[PDB]
RNA sequence: GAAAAGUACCCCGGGAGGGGAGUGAAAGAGUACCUGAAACCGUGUGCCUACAAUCCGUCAGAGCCUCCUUUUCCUCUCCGGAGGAGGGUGGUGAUGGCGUGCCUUUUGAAGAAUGAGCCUGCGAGUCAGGGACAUGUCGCAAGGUUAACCCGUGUGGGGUA
RNA sequence: GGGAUGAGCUGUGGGUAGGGGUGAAAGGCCAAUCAAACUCCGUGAUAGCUGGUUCUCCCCGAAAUGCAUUUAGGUGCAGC
RNA sequence: CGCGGCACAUCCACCUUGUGGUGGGUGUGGGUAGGGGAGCGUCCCUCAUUCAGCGAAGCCACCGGGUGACCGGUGGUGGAGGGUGGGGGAGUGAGAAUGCAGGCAUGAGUAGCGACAAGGCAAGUGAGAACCUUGCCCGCCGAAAGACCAAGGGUUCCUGG
């Protein structure tokens, strides 16, 4: 339907839910309008998420050879990867569990007039 | 108090969808001939070189 | 005895109560060193 | 092995079935030999040969056709000379 | 992976990670690696839901969407069904009636009695003995059968206590 | 808040071991457990007590009474 | 009661008249504890036969089938073992045991982030600085929150990464 490019950032050490809070700002926006929402968004997941939209636009510019002023984030989502299990010691001998969660972030930009 | 019963898939999604970041507004800045985007509350420091645009 | 726990370490009293040369003085201790060789422990 | 360093072999089963070449190096503890000309591996820079299994080669008897190989006590030293089958030479 | 041939070179990035090339029969085999199920988490899309009291289903049932097909046309037909009506799969279910989860244990439980957060895996009437009783069947039958042991590569042949 | 030259507090080294120790006596303490510690073995202890016991269909289908019982929430025999 | 399907029992007629088959009447078929009879499914061995790198097992989807457990067809994924028939043997079927091992939800982006000494600015380094370096202000301890040994720990010390 449209020419496109894909970029994946596997094993990003941001939680999947705290990454989904920030991908819902830039879904369906143009790339020049998405890399500056993520600049002035105070959340910390906008670091790793904006390094994938910028590389999906760099993959569509170099490899496919597309005009960068017409791109748009057509499909972006975040999944989970593996989880490390840690121990946080608590009162009266109880030992609880901490989960270090990771993510996979997929951005599919596309060129459309 | 403890949860008496686990919440079903329709009550744990109606609450969780309300935890979300609010987007900010962006305005236009032309300093040093390069057009950028800042929020309006930082419009003064954009025209004084106090904003690092990375 | 407030705050004091049960293991106060001292390496000289460890070897005079649990050492090798105190196992080897009685028949009940030769058969502990033999039952830990038979199991294959590193430390006896 | 029964296939040495200096021998010339014929590949009897593989992608290079029918090609002749001499052994460059033999690996007796894996039953594998290096034959020049066979299975060129396009290794990335920073082509050479990979070893094939020694059961895929037969020794050329210095007379053309390949053969299985046997042994003959030389009656002078006692060291068994590695001789060819199919009419008994070298 | 059969073989390390373990992704040279370029690109975004501090890296991690990726994209294009490349190797390979296969990268739907990339040192997080054969096959890759379920729980669980997303994204896109069709229908439904913001005046309604719901063991969450079942029977009745309108409307929308999707996909295959007789009819009379558009004869542009070598076309395509272009659309609507008719009929039939699949998805949703406005609305009406009916409707007190499962197990264990009890005179009696939807029970405000017990047990289970979910999924995948494991987890409970078995075996020994010329034992005992009773049967179904097979061989021999006024007789039936050997045990230890001996001889054979065997599951076969001897062996009357 | 009580003692704070005393029946004081404390370091280091040693001694007392399970029907035994030790106790200015509370069944206290003896390695976060004591009206008889912990570990291993007898051992897959025993429990008239509770829990569990997994595929299908076809036919038939009860009892909760009598008698005896260290027996009354068990079991033998009869009834069904 | 009517029309059509199934099963069990009994009776009357046929066929090698009980190992029992075919046809026709009348009767019967709620069911726990329990008794009886007949079957589906996974695995293993043996005998016969037949598929499979022109794609077996396993998994996923769809369309069909049988009175039930369940079965077949076509396609997708996948890469080396299955199907049918006569027999033999079982670690042969889970949903519950506050069962066990692993993975993952709900609570929930919630509580908490460990003393009531208290940090601030400038310049620096760097992709990244409330916490790192340097300088100056401010505050806390000062019978210790300073300086040393013993027990204990064992390379935590210094330098360069
Ligand atoms: Mg503790
Ligand atoms: Mg060979
Ligand atoms: Mg690459
Ligand atoms: Mg590629
Ligand atoms: Mg190729
Ligand atoms: Mg192939
Ligand atoms: Mg393949
Ligand atoms: Mg994995
Ligand atoms: Mg895999
Ligand atoms: Mg309405
Ligand atoms: Mg009502
Ligand atoms: Mg209804
Ligand atoms: Mg009661
Ligand atoms: Mg209940
Ligand atoms: Mg309730
Ligand atoms: Mg009870
Ligand atoms: Mg419970
Ligand atoms: Mg369970
Ligand atoms: Mg008989
Ligand atoms: Mg005082
Ligand atoms: Mg006083
Ligand atoms: Mg005083
Ligand atoms: Mg008393
Ligand atoms: Mg104690
Ligand atoms: Mg006792
Ligand atoms: Mg015994
Ligand atoms: Mg028992
Ligand atoms: Mg009945
Ligand atoms: Mg009885
Ligand atoms: Mg009836
Ligand atoms: Mg019945
Ligand atoms: Mg029953
Ligand atoms: Mg294929
Ligand atoms: Mg198998
Ligand atoms: Mg099937
Ligand atoms: Mg198939
Ligand atoms: Mg298949
Ligand atoms: Mg099978
Ligand atoms: Mg068989
Ligand atoms: Mg069988
Ligand atoms: Mg079993
Ligand atoms: Mg299960
Ligand atoms: Mg668990
Ligand atoms: Mg809360
Ligand atoms: Mg808080
Ligand atoms: Mg703190
Ligand atoms: Mg600074
Ligand atoms: Mg240091
Ligand atoms: Mg250092």
UniProtKB/Swiss-Prot annotation, chain A:
One Gene Ontology MF term: rRNA binding
Protein name: Large ribosomal subunit protein uL22
Cellular component, GO, one term: peptidoglycan-based cell wall
Biological process, per Gene Ontology: translation
UniProt keyword annotations, A-Z: Acetylation, Ribonucleoprotein, Ribosomal protein, RNA-binding, rRNA-binding
Miscellaneous note of the record: Was identified as a high-confidence drug target.
Keyword Transcription regulation: no
Keyword Translocase: no
Function summary: This protein binds specifically to 23S rRNA; its binding is stimulated by other ribosomal proteins, e.g. L4, L17, and L20. It is important during the early stages of 50S assembly. It makes multiple contacts with different domains of the 23S rRNA in the assembled 50S subunit and ribosome. The globular domain of the protein is located near the polypeptide exit tunnel on the outside of the subunit, while an extended beta-hairpin is found that lines the wall of the exit tunnel in the center of the 70S ribosome.
Subunit structure: Part of the 50S ribosomal subunit.
Family to which this protein belongs: Belongs to the universal ribosomal protein uL22 family.
Superkingdom as given in the UniProt entry: Bacteria
Species whose genome carries this gene: Mycobacterium tuberculosis (strain ATCC 25618 / H37Rv)
From Swiss-Prot, chain B:
Pfam families: Ribosomal_L32p
Family listed: Belongs to the bacterial ribosomal protein bL32 family.
Alphabetical UniProt keywords: Ribonucleoprotein, Ribosomal protein
Membrane-crossing segments per the record: none
InterPro entries: Ribosomal_bL32, Ribosomal_zn-bd
Biased composition (Basic residues): 1-18
Name of the featured protein: Large ribosomal subunit protein bL32
Species this chain originates from: Mycobacterium tuberculosis (strain ATCC 25618 / H37Rv)
Stretches the record annotates as Disordered: 1-21
A GO molecular-function descriptor: structural constituent of ribosome
An annotated GO cellular component: large ribosomal subunit
GO terms (BP aspect): translation
From Swiss-Prot, chain C:
Gene Ontology terms: cellular component: ribonucleoprotein complex; ribosome
Keywords: Ribonucleoprotein, Ribosomal protein
Entry keyword annotation includes S-adenosyl-L-methionine: no
Gene Ontology biological-process annotations: translation
Gene Ontology molecular function terms on file: structural constituent of ribosome
Superkingdom, natural source: Bacteria
Signal sequence annotation: none
Xref: HAMAP family: Ribosomal_bL34
Family classification: Belongs to the bacterial ribosomal protein bL34 family.
PANTHER family, sorted: LARGE RIBOSOMAL SUBUNIT PROTEIN BL34M, MITOCHONDRIAL RIBOSOMAL PROTEIN 34 FAMILY MEMBER
Name the UniProt record assigns to this protein: Large ribosomal subunit protein bL34
Native organism: Mycobacterium tuberculosis (strain ATCC 25618 / H37Rv)
Lineage per the UniProt record: Bacteria, Bacillati, Actinomycetota, Actinomycetes, Mycobacteriales
Swiss-Prot record, chain D:
Regions annotated as coiled coil: none
Single GO biological process annotation from the record: translation
GO cellular component: cytosolic large ribosomal subunit; peptidoglycan-based cell wall
Protein encoded by which gene: rplX
Keyword Glycoprotein: no
Source species, domain of life: Bacteria
Name of protein: Large ribosomal subunit protein uL24
Subunit structure comment from the entry: Part of the 50S ribosomal subunit.
């Amino acid at each position: 339907e449209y020419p496109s490019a894909v970029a994946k950032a596997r094993f990003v050490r941001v939680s999947p839910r705290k990454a989904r809070r920030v991908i819902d700002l830039v879904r369906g926006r143009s790339v020049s309008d998405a890399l500056d929402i993520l600049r002035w968004a105070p959340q910390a997941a906008s670091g790793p998420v904006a390094k994938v939209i910028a590389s999906a636009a760099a993959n569509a510019q170099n490899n496919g050879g597309l005009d960068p002023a017409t791109l748009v984030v057509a499909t972006v989502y975040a999944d989970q990867g593996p989880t490390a299990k840690r121990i946080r010691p608590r009162a009266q001998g109880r030992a609880f569990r901490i989960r270090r969660r990771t993510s996979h972030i997929t951005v599919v930009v596309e060129s459309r007039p | 108090a403890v949860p008496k019963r686990r919440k079903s898939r329709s009550n744990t999604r109606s609450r969780r969808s309300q935890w979300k970041a609010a987007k900010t507004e962006l305005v236009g800045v032309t300093v040093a001939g390069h057009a950028h985007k800042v929020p309006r509350r930082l419009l003064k420091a954009a025209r004084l070189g106090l904003i690092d645009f990375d | 005895t407030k705050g004091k726990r049960t293991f106060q370490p001292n390496n000289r009293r460890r070897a005079r109560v649990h050492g090798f040369r105190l196992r080897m003085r009685t028949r009940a201790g030769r058969s502990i060193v033999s039952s830990r060789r038979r199991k294959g422990r590193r430390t006896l | 092995m029964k296939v040495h360093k200096g021998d010339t072999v014929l590949v009897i089963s593989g992608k290079d079935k029918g090609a002749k070449g001499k052994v460059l190096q033999a690996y007796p503890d894996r039953n594998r030999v290096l034959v020049e000309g066979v299975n060129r591996i396009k290794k990335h820079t920073a082509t050479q040969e990979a070893p094939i299994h020694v059961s895929n080669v037969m020794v050329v008897d210095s007379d053309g056709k390949p053969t299985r190989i046997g042994y003959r006590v030389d009656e002078e030293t006692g060291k068994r000379v590695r001789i060819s089958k199919r009419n008994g030479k070298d």
